[PDB]
Amino acid sequence: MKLTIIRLEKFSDQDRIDLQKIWPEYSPSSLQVDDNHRIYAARFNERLLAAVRVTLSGTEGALDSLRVREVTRRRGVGQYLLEEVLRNNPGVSCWWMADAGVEDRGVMTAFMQALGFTAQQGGWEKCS
Amino acid sequence: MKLTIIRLEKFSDQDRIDLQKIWPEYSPSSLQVDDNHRIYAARFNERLLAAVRVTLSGTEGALDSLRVREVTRRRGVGQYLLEEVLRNNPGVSCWWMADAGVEDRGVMTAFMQALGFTAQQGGWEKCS
Amino acid sequence: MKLTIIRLEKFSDQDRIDLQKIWPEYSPSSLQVDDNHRIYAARFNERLLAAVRVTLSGTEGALDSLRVREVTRRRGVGQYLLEEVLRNNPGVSCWWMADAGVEDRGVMTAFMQALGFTAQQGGWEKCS
Amino acid sequence: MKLTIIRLEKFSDQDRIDLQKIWPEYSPSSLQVDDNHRIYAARFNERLLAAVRVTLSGTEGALDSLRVREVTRRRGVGQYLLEEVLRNNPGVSCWWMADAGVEDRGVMTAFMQALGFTAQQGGWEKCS
Amino acid sequence: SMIRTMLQGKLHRVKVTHADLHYEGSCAIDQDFLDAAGILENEAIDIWNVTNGKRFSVYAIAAERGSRIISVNGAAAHCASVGDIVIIASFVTMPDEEARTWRPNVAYFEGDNEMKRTAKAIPVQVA
Amino acid sequence: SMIRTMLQGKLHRVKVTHADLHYEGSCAIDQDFLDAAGILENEAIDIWNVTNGKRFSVYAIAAERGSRIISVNGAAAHCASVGDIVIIASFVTMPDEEARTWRPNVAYFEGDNEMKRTAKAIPVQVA
Amino acid sequence: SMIRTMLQGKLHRVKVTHADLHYEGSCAIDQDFLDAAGILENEAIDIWNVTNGKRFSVYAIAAERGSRIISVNGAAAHCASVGDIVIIASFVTMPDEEARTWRPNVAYFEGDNEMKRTAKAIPVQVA
Amino acid sequence: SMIRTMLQGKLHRVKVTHADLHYEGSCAIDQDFLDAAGILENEAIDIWNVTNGKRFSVYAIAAERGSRIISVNGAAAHCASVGDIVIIASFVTMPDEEARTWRPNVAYFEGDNEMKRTAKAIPVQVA
Ligand SMILES: CC(=O)SCCNC(=O)CCNC(=O)[C@H](O)C(C)(C)COP(=O)(O)OP(=O)(O)OC[C@H]1O[C@@H](n2cnc3c(N)ncnc32)[C@H](O)[C@@H]1OP(=O)(O)O
Ligand SMILES: CC(=O)SCCNC(=O)CCNC(=O)[C@H](O)C(C)(C)COP(=O)(O)OP(=O)(O)OC[C@H]1O[C@@H](n2cnc3c(N)ncnc32)[C@H](O)[C@@H]1OP(=O)(O)O
Ligand SMILES: CC(=O)SCCNC(=O)CCNC(=O)[C@H](O)C(C)(C)COP(=O)(O)OP(=O)(O)OC[C@H]1O[C@@H](n2cnc3c(N)ncnc32)[C@H](O)[C@@H]1OP(=O)(O)O
Ligand SMILES: CC(=O)SCCNC(=O)CCNC(=O)[C@H](O)C(C)(C)COP(=O)(O)OP(=O)(O)OC[C@H]1O[C@@H](n2cnc3c(N)ncnc32)[C@H](O)[C@@H]1OP(=O)(O)O
Ligand SMILES: [Mg+2]
Ligand SMILES: [Mg+2]
Ligand SMILES: [Mg+2]
Ligand SMILES: [Mg+2]
């Protein structure tokens, strides 16, 4: 089906294969999910194309490990994924993403700016 | 069906809903129709798009309350409606339309001129 | 069917109606046909579009009354009709067409020249 | 089927008719084929379009009688035929083609150069 | 330089007068009708048959002016019969900026191919 | 000067709200939907019907803004029924060099023709 | 800058000589026939089958000059059989002003693909 | 200024790997295959199905390079099944003088979508 942003609470075997391609550096389990430690992913034609980890602390929220599969970059997947994460967590007024693990900080900055985030020391913030 | 100009002698419930959209200022009944007090309307795909009231006094005829739904303006509906009113009342040699209620007199004038009417004080005349 | 040049030996009722349109000045019978007095016509989609009378005297042949219906001029009907008349009468080495009844002699001349005929006094000749 | 390069070990009647068109100067039999004396041909839609004779002597190989039907020249048939002959005889490190019978040596040279062969006295060589 | 494909004109609900597999393949149309819709002799046209649902593409040829003929000829005669009601359309291409203001040539018919109205626009369909 | 034919835009999985053989032949589309996909009044469109598999080409006309109408009218009503789920596409032509960077106007729908998302690209399908 | 789609040429009532699903998809046409109708190798063509009513679009490839071949190959062989009588057409685009004077390249056939006539116009159909 | 429609390229006898009505409507093609035939993401393509005879037009989207995917998605999945052998073609337009020397981009496949050959011409079919 069309590109859809989902919150992953249980992983199918296909989700595990796909998550391994998105994040070869993690080996899940290792991916504990609960009410405040969420994984959102972008699904298209029965496959995951991108994922992000979200940590919620009420009005403050943190994003890490945002990656879109290289093969499908610059097609609006990353933008839609973050837009949907923000829309589905309307209680958060301040979002932080650290620059950890980012392969190309200048591309990340231009993406984050497109999404309304400000560049700060160590990462990006959107604190409406 | 294709755009068709009809003379309304009885109103269906759909005609009443549509006439309310064309003329929200009238609340019919209030619309008495008889041999000399006629309503012509433009119908397209089972809906009325425009209507006009005609008062006949033999060789003299009067038009009032000409309105085409804003959504479908500048597609020849108003022109066809008046053309057909004139063609279907060949005994009338002098037609009058007063400027009453007209929202934009300069647009009305340009329309009426396109239909062969002359601008006069208080309205428009075509008196062949 | 496609444009076809036929030699008419018997006339159907449809041929009579069509021949009347091609030649309103003749009223057939009046059109005697025999071995040396032939009528060739151009047929398209079950109707005659053009006709010509041919008189044969062995190695000499004469054409008269060539007319293509005005509605279908300048579409190669006249050319094909005469080409086929010439091809189907290979024994004739000298052809004559008189200028009788021709409505526009300059158009006729340009047509006849296109078909290899020379303009002479009183008509056109092709005498290979 | 699509253009395919085949090694001919037995000839159908159709292969004989086609080979006669490719090589009218040979009258097969006369075409002995065995392990070292091979005929490769280009087949397209159930017909042979081009053929070449190959003589193998281990690491040395010789080509003669290369001809593509004139009707289908400059459509990549000759190139594909020789490419496939070379690929299917990977043990040969030195190939020779003599200039015998070639109708237009300058066209042959430009073809052979396109295939990586060098022009020499009496023919063309590719000796990797 | 983005080019749009736009409805050029249409003959709305003409009736087929002739349909014959042996006539020369084409759709022959009264010249008056061609002029009203802006359709040219030899132009590609699409035919949508309201009676039987078939949709097919051919090319136009002229029929005698005033004959009211709509003749579906040749292989196309598999797709329509005498008395079928058809829509005949032609499409043109133009640049995007011209397409935005384009007005197609529409002609409407009733009865035995009597032309009732020509127009330059189709109204908006309301709820 | 090699010219490509490219998807201009599409309405993805809209539902047919009206289908009537007697309505004027066309597909009438809510003006908001036309704007989202970049489709013009009078433009040629292709319709691919997911419910019944039929594929047909017609032209667009406008329906009242906000009505959510997708009305398959005239002969086209042989090809779709009320409640069918369709994809409506328009194609444009442009030169090869422009085609390489072209981004189509895509709009996605759920429910009763509620527009959920607009986008400028379709992702890559992975194994 | 309004561009028309016009009949470029046609092969009228040629007979299919070969039809094989395993041959390379295309319609192969005697080069003499291509020349007569102005059809190019690799050009898109429409085929209208008078025998069975099927209408399909493919592309032309050349067959040996003088072979009289009309070979319907590959998937197209689902749409025609040996001995079927077909019309093969190609369409070009040109500006409106050129379209008005355009003359298509028509070639007519009888028997076993014997070319009987070439022409530059189709007559008017009369009542 | 007479413009021809020419075969741009083709994927000859690829096999459908996926066919799903619920996938986003399109035909997704391994990027290597698109490159070999010169087909662009978002370009209009025709699909001719050798297995079942169906002929349909859609648009291309990319599939992961090296996946060998040919995915017939959405409404198009009514027209093909997994394991069907299809020809996928794209057409471009160009002026007559360029068309005469045009060479299309052809790619040939066997087995499980293994690309065997690319070429720039189709041979002449002989008697
Ligand atoms: C274990 C771990 O995961 S640690 C985290 C590791 N993550 C990384 O290293 C990030 C790797 N990069 C990515 O995953 C992606 O490139 C992302 C997330 C930065 C962007 O995702 P995409 O889906 O490619 O971006 P998307 O198409 O939605 O872009 C939206 C906008 O961002 C901007 N943008 C995106 N990519 C770029 C680029 N390469 N250059 C410039 N601007 C860009 C543009 O404004 C673009 O809008 P536009 O295309 O209309 O111009
Ligand atoms: C209770 C009561 O009803 S009181 C009466 C209230 N009525 C009003 O206030 C009138 C409101 N306006 C309208 O209803 C319409 O705008 C009308 C009747 C004036 C025109 O109806 P339309 O269907 O839009 O006009 P139509 O498309 O037939 O126009 C015919 C010609 O008129 C002229 N014309 C129409 N609208 C305009 C315009 N906005 N500007 C300039 N000229 C115009 C043009 O010449 C046009 O021909 P063209 O399009 O070929 O250029
Ligand atoms: C009772 C009786 O019938 S008496 C005889 C009465 N006959 C007449 O008055 C003749 C009336 N005119 C006609 O019937 C026709 O106009 C004809 C016979 C002259 C020409 O027939 P058509 O079918 O129109 O001509 P056709 O299309 O075959 O023309 C062939 C060539 O002739 C020339 N030609 C034809 N018409 C014209 C013209 N109007 N102007 C200039 N050249 C012309 C052209 O070279 C043309 O070739 P092209 O179109 O490739 O340029
Ligand atoms: C009994 C006997 O057979 S004796 C042997 C007799 N043989 C001869 O006389 C050879 C007759 N000629 C031929 O058979 C053919 O013309 C051949 C074999 C030379 C070439 O075969 P073709 O299938 O036409 O060539 P092909 O299309 O594969 O050409 C490949 C390349 O060669 C070159 N080439 C081929 N033909 C020509 C030409 N006429 N001019 C210039 N270059 C050429 C080009 O580089 C071409 O690549 P390109 O088209 O991308 O430009
Ligand atoms: Mg992306
Ligand atoms: Mg209007
Ligand atoms: Mg003529
Ligand atoms: Mg060749």
Author numbering:
A (entry chain B), B (entry chain B), C (entry chain B), D (entry chain B): 1 to 128
E (entry chain A), F (entry chain A), G (entry chain A), H (entry chain A): 0 to 126
Q: Paper's wording?
A:
We have recently described an additional component in the pantothenate biosynthetic pathway, PanZ, which promotes the activation of the zymogen, PanD, to form aspartate α-decarboxylase (ADC) in a CoA-dependent manner. PanD (encoded by panD) is post-translationally modified to form its catalytically active form, ADC, by cleavage of the peptide backbone between residues Gly24 and Ser25, leading to the formation of a pyruvoyl cofactor from Ser25. In addition, we show that PanZ acts as a CoA-dependent inhibitor of ADC catalysis.
Bipyrimidal crystals were reproducibly obtained using a 1.1-fold excess of PanZ over PanD(T57V) and a 2-fold excess of AcCoA, with respect to PanZ. X-Ray diffraction data were collected from these crystals to 1.7 Å resolution at room temperature using an in-house X-ray source. The structure of the protein complex revealed a highly symmetric heterooctameric complex. The binding site for AcCoA is very close to the protein-protein interface, accounting for the previously observed CoA dependence of the interaction (Monteiro et al., 2012). In particular, binding of AcCoA appears to stabilize the PanZ Leu66-Gly76 loop, which forms contacts with PanD. At the same time, the acetyl portion of the cofactor is held away from PanD on the distal face of PanZ, suggesting that acetylation is not required for activation, consistent with the findings of Stuecker et al. To further investigate how the activation reaction is catalyzed, we compared the structure of the PanD(T57V)-AcCoA.PanZ complex with that of the previously reported structure of the wild-type PanD zymogen in the absence of PanZ (Schmitzberger et al., 2003). The location of the peptide backbone in the immediate region of eventual peptide cleavage (Glu23-Cys26) in the PanD zymogen is largely similar to that observed in the PanD-AcCoA.PanZ complex, although the exact conformations of individual residues, particularly the carbonyl of Gly24, have changed. There is no evidence for ester formation in the structure of PanD(T57V), either alone (Webb et al., 2014) or in complex with PanZ.AcCoA.
